[PDB]
């Protein structure tokens, strides 16, 4: 395909070229309709600066870079790739997963003094929410929350997920915002600022921690030392630091696609009206009429030591979708005599 | 294989070359899929600077170093090695061990005055936790704890391990952070700072101390004498002292692999529901359906003098895995008449 990759050089030409190649590959995969979950495993094998790349067992086979330019101080890379969009996979027949973006906090407010970027966590969780909402393939964002999610309180995680109707809750801590000064006699000072982050995803059905990853990137701080920067403004997010943080958010989205996309989606029972039950997933999540679903009885217990545990009882109950709304759906129980055993909170999975 | 080893010279070219060779060998073994537990016994036989190395009874037979360069003040070593990844071994058929990283403390706060690196213990235990989580082969990290683990209180160790669900607890003391000054008339002063550490691993099932080792390394302190260094920042961990501490953490991980990896993993009984019991290990620990497990009745007593002791009663009970969750698993007792003798806290081992 014909794609362009744009990335600014911070300290190494190799890193900027690799970032531009990643951007071009991401655009090519998005246009080709291929899954973006598989991209996050291709990057490690892209550390080398070889003109030709060979891969096996992937939707992309050979990568050939034809043009590399450093116009306006940032590397531009033009490549041609062959993408094979597979019609099958463990991610195409699943309903969309609702995700709640939790509180992202700055561990050390001391590091945010330069620029007074103290609301960077909130304005970055907003970016993560919008990235998951309008860029992901298998995720739906149900908003942000002001509460902090911890692994010590699975009950609170379950309650907050129930309140917001979220299958997973994602929250992080920003651990490094410090900067160093590089000085040259010919020119002015260069301030390279750090952005480290540790993201954690919790399963709202049982309170377990299902995802855990750490990110660290560096970018130039173009603003003055004594200048105050607003994190909601376009001045912050159009700068080199802002571009780096946007790339970090994209990597978060790609990692979530890589890890959670092929987990089987489990819509929950919202209400039971005799022989008809209601599902928390609807038309906007990919539900189509005539779908057959299998019911699981949910029983998740905190064990004797306070650690969350999971236990599902298999059921002989199968349901079919009768009416579909934008955000909910109605299902009819195919075994009327077993309809009395369905309670609120039981989960279902689509029969393939 | 084609590997590169990078290591900075501190006081001896031999030490830097050896560190670069260790780095290259570690990367080669990690890429080759060979076990990293065996690397820690190969280093002692690498003290000599011979161009050719001969070894017997190991996954690597001959080591030949072809390129040695001192570019940018740090030694780069390029070698070719032949690695034979064994499909067998006492470490491949075992479930992953959950490890809790305990409190690491600075024994003398006086030594941390230069740079005010007083939270070096906590920010280093974080590095050890991440190293065990995302670099080890046979370990899973269940987080960090703020409590101090001692050999005088096996009961506290058992309680904390139960609370965190950890099979082993690892904690240490930082015993040396002092520095010396090397002065030359031609150039500026060189401050070489010490980092000594004593790591101790306790078994959470009985409170015993199963591992004990001491580490000591030296690296240049590039910062000013009166400058304050933040131990969470990239300025600290990208410096020579930071690279040395990262190498120390890697050596800790390799020693844990060398010692604890071939211990038979013993998952614990979490809950008993009639004929079905729950296991604290799940899909993320390597549990697969159809596995056969043997039950052991656990009875560990503190003797008359207050010292921990172990005692397991063998059982005629065998269990098979029925359903697998990400963090737990369900087992069915193959002897229903003996199911009443299973209590919470009994351990199991996979039948090979």
């Amino acid at each position: 395909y014909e794609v362009t990759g744009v990335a600014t050089i911070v300290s190494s030409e190799e890193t900027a070229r690799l970032h531009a190649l990643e951007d071009a590959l991401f655009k090519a995969v998005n246009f080709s309709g291929a899954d973006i979950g598989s991209i996050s495993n291709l990057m490690p094998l892209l550390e080398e600066s070889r003109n030709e790349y060979q891969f096996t067992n992937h939707e992309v086979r050979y990568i050939l870079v034809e043009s590399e330019r450093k116009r306006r101080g940032k590397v531009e890379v033009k490549i041609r790739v062959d993408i094979y969009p597979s019609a099958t996979g463990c991610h195409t027949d699943q309903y969309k997963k609702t995700i709640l973006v939790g509180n992202i906090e700055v561990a050390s407010p001391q590091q945010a003094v330069m620029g007074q970027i103290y609301q960077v966590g909130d304005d970055f969780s907003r970016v993560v929410n919008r990235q998951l909402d309008q860029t992901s393939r298998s995720f739906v964002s149900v908003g942000t929350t002001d509460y902090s999610i911890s692994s010590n309180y699975p009950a609170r995680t379950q309650m907050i997920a129930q309140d917001n109707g979220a299958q997973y809750i994602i929250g992080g801590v920003i651990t490094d915002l410090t900067a160093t000064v590089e000085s040259q006699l010919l020119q002015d000072d260069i301030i390279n600022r750090q952005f480290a982050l540790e993201m954690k995803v919790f399963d709202g059905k049982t309170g377990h921690e299902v995802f855990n990853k750490a990110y660290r990137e560096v970018a130039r701080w173009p603003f003055a030392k004594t200048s105050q920067v607003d994190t909601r403004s376009a001045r912050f997010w159009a700068s080199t630091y802002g571009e780096m943080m946007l790339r970090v958010s994209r990597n978060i989205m790609l990692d979530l696609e890589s890890e959670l996309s092929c987990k089987i989606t489990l819509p929950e029972v919202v209400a039971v009206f005799g022989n008809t039950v209601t599902m928390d997933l609807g038309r906007m999540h990919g539900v189509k009429e005539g779908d057959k679903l299998q019911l699981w009885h949910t029983a998740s217990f905190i064990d004797q030591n306070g650690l969350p545990r999971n236990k599902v009882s298999q059921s002989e109950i199968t349901l079919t979708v009768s009416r579909i709304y934008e955000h909910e759906a109605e299902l009819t129980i195919d075994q009327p005599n077993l309809a009395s055993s369905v309670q609120i909170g039981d989960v279902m999975n689509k029969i393939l | 294989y084609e590997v590169t080893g990078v290591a900075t010279i501190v006081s001896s070219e031999e030490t830097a070359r050896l560190h670069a060779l260790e780095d290259a060998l570690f990367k080669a073994v990690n890429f080759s899929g060979a076990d990293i537990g065996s690397i820690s016994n190969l280093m002692p036989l690498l003290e000599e600077s011979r161009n050719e190395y001969q070894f017997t009874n190991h996954e690597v037979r001959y080591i030949l170093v072809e390129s040695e360069r001192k570019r940018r003040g740090k030694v780069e070593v390029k070698i070719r090695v032949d690695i034979y990844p064994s499909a067998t071994g006492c470490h491949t058929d075992q479930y992953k061990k959950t490890i809790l990283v305990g409190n690491i403390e600075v024994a003398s706060p006086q030594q941390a005055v230069m740079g005010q690196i007083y939270q070096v213990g906590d920010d280093f235990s974080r590095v050890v936790n991440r190293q065990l989580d995302q670099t080890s082969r046979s370990f899973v990290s269940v987080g960090t704890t703020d409590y101090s683990i001692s050999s005088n209180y096996p009961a506290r160790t058992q309680m904390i391990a139960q609370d965190n669900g950890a099979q082993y607890i690892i904690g240490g003391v930082i015993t040396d952070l002092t520095a010396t000054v090397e002065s030359q008339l031609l150039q500026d002063d060189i401050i070489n700072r010490q980092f000594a550490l004593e790591m101790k691993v306790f078994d959470g099932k009985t409170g015993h101390e199963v591992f004990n080792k001491a580490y000591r390394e030296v690296a240049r302190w590039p910062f000013a004498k009166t400058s304050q260094v933040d131990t969470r920042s990239a300025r600290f961990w990208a410096s020579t002292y930071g690279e040395m501490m990262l190498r120390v953490s890697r050596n800790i991980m390799l020693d844990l692999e060398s010692e604890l990896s071939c211990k038979i993993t013993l998952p614990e009984v979490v809950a008993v529901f009639g004929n079905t019991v729950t296991m604290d290990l799940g899909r993320m620990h390597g549990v697969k359906e159809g596995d056969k497990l043997q039950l052991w009745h656990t009875a560990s007593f503190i003797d008359q003098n207050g010292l921990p002791r172990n005692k397991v009663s063998q059982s005629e009970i065998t269990l098979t895995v029925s359903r697998i969750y990400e963090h737990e698993a369900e087992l069915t007792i193959d002897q229903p008449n003996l199911a009443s003798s299973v209590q919470i806290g009994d351990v199991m081992n996979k039948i090979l």
């Binding site: 509180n103 906090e105 700055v106 407010p109 001391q110 003094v113 330069m114 007074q116 103290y118 002001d146 509460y147 902090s148 309180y153 009950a155 609170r156 309650m159 907050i160 309140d163 030392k225 004594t226 | -």
Partner: protein, 52 residues
Amino acid sequence: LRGRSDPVAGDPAWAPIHPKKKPEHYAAATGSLFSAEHITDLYDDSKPRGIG
């Protein structure tokens, strides 16, 4: 020709640190308005005790 560098007003090395915002209580978990991080003692003198 001066040999000295004048300080600048607003230096981050001397700027104040805005206190971290405390997390919300989420009273729905316990049914109570008590939160260990949010309670205010009626009789305390309110000495400085935290950043900011």
